[PDB]
DNA sequence: CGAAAACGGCCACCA
DNA sequence: TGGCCGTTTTCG
């Protein structure tokens, strides 16, 4: 179980993400999906006794929001070497849906030589909206997304890593494929509300957390 | 009669599913169809005196929602070996309608060597909607579904096992073929309402049940 | 004959 | 209602 670094969120998840499965967090923009991704990108490298996976991180960005400085902040919060964190995070920006899936081909071969624990795909659904904008082409983007999700599940079962994808809510296919769906909504200021909206094992429940300069971290009224 | 593991639902069914016949549960998404399937996948292995069938389980998944951990939770609830439960559940994900029917060919030969009591097909109608999306191809998916249902009835009469298929309600052919139709709807929180909408023997009636971490289990206000 | 435009008709979404 | 395409006519 990879620690989220929010204790309340860890309790909500019973200790953190299950490696080897896809966890989807759907919420409005600015809810902190990207911030949680940046935090996990570092916490994954933490020792297992500290809630990490003792593995490198993979950040596939489609939205430009990748900040190595956020990774440095998370590393210094938990006392990890920021330089080693950036050395254990491989980053690449996907320009389109086809490029987004093509990067998985390099990811599968690269993930064999080194132990990874986390795969991050940020604005995973944005490129299927910007690229495929027509109505007759909807089935094509749905097929590409389906294949992409199957590839995610395959890599998860192959390397035993956690698969994190982010969705902006301004597909029903992900429900059966994703094991845990988390709904994120803004509480005013920088403090966010998290809700579980389906889990066969986890209750439907809510937990409050905040977005702090160092971290994605528990709410401290 | 295979125990549902909800006492109120067992009373609704007069003790549980009749083996050798198809029981259809149609309801909205998140009503708990999959949860009931996971529970039954373990309860089938229970002794007959405990409401089981003393047989192995078969889970054909089309939606990715298969969770061995849910099976482990159901096994520990009723005190069954979780490892033996997973050893008595054969699992396979159908990628399309043709693959969904093709898996029945392996199922028929495999079900001869060992005693099974339950066959689960989850999102059974989803692949006929994702694969066959056009309007001119509707008769083709209806024919494939008809043949699939006939194969289900044949296997039910051959092995005396319970046939469970799940349908998302966002065909009229199943009515004559399915013996008991159950309508599932959400009560808020995790507690679900079950209604019988046709049975020649069972009354039209309703029963309240809940979805608990261990189990599909009676409502406990 | 044919550019071009002016109309007409047809479709998309979901209401 | 907006867009696109078939057409029709109109003017050179």
Residue numbers in the entry:
A (entry chain K), B (entry chain L): 101 to 270, 289 to 339
What do the study's own words say?
RAD51 is the central eukaryotic recombinase required for meiotic recombination and mitotic repair of double-strand DNA breaks (DSBs). Here we report the cryo-electron microscopy structures of human RAD51–nucleosome complexes, in which RAD51 forms ring and filament conformations. We found that RAD51 forms multiple conformations in the complex with the nucleosome, such as ring forms with eight (octameric), nine (nonameric) or ten (decameric) protomers, and a filament form. Notably, we found that in all RAD51–nucleosome complexes, the NLDs of RAD51 directly bind to the DNA wrapped in the nucleosome.
At the other DNA end of the nucleosome, the eight-base-pair dsDNA plus a three-base 3′ ssDNA overhang, designed to mimic the dsDNA–ssDNA junction created at a DSB terminus, protruded as the linker DNA of the nucleosome. Consistently, the linker DNA is incorporated into the central hole of the nucleosome-bound RAD51 ring. In this central hole, we observed the electron microscopy density of the dsDNA–ssDNA junction region at the DSB site. Notably, this junction region is located close to a RAD51 L1 loop and may directly interact with it. Another RAD51 DNA-binding loop, the L2 loop, also seemed to be located near the DSB site, although its electron microscopy density is partially disordered. The RAD51 L1 and L2 loops are known as the active DNA-binding sites for the homologous-pairing reaction. Therefore, the RAD51 ring might first assemble on the linker DNA as an active ring form, and then subsequently recognize the dsDNA–ssDNA junction by the L1 loop, when the ssDNA region that has been processed by enzymatic resection from a DSB end reaches the central hole of the RAD51 rings.
